[PDB]
Amino acid sequence: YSGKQSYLGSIDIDISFRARGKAVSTVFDQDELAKQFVRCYESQIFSPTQYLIMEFQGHFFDLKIRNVQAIDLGDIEPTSAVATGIETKGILTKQTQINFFKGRDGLVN
Amino acid sequence: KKMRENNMMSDDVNLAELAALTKNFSGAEIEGLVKSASSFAINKTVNIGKGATKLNTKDIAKLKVTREDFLNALNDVTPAFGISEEDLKTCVEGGMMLYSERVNSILKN
């Protein structure tokens, strides 16, 4: 279906607290979060608006892939447009630029 | 001041000509000039709107302002007291020609 863009170049993920009463003010390291997502979920195919439940250091979060950027191997530059359309999907790699964005509630620090 | 010591500025700009160009600028206009020049440089990277998401370390890792950005910036900020000499420069839009000796004598006198 994809033809060439089989891998995830950059991935943008909205992080939210699953439980409102479990808001905790710890400073969360993006690199560790990315590592956690990759170690738990590797080479998995992802779409926009796909949801996930994430367990980091005992804390449960709801993750919403807001948009996806699919690129083929061998593309030096990320010239590909980031698609908000759910059709675009790709396969996770250990090098995807993972940007985490505050949820609509905006409590994750 | 800080730009220069932080090595965020091209070596081509020389302050003397800037000081020459800004005839009737007040003290409070120069800062706006700085702002606009910066805005041009920074917009060159982000391209707000259409070509979004190009942000990356390489782009931001070599940002420097350029002289032509200042030259461009002169078109946004305008003096407030230097509004009447504009009439004088537009008075000779028809050009000047030396079809006769007489004009030279008059100008010399």
From Swiss-Prot, chain A:
Tell me where in or outside the cell this protein is found. Cytoplasm
Top-level taxonomic group: Eukaryota
> Which family is annotated?
Belongs to the AAA ATPase family.
Could you describe the subunit structure of this protein? Homohexamer. Binds to SEC17.
Other noteworthy facts: Present with 5920 molecules/cell in log phase SD medium.
Function field: Required for vesicle-mediated transport. Catalyzes the fusion of transport vesicles within the Golgi cisternae. Is also required for transport from the endoplasmic reticulum to the Golgi stack. Seems to function as a fusion protein required for the delivery of cargo proteins to all compartments of the Golgi stack independent of vesicle origin.
Task: Report the protein name in the record.
Answer: Vesicular-fusion protein SEC18
Q: Which organism is it from?
A: Saccharomyces cerevisiae (strain ATCC 204508 / S288c)
Tell me the name of the encoding gene: SEC18
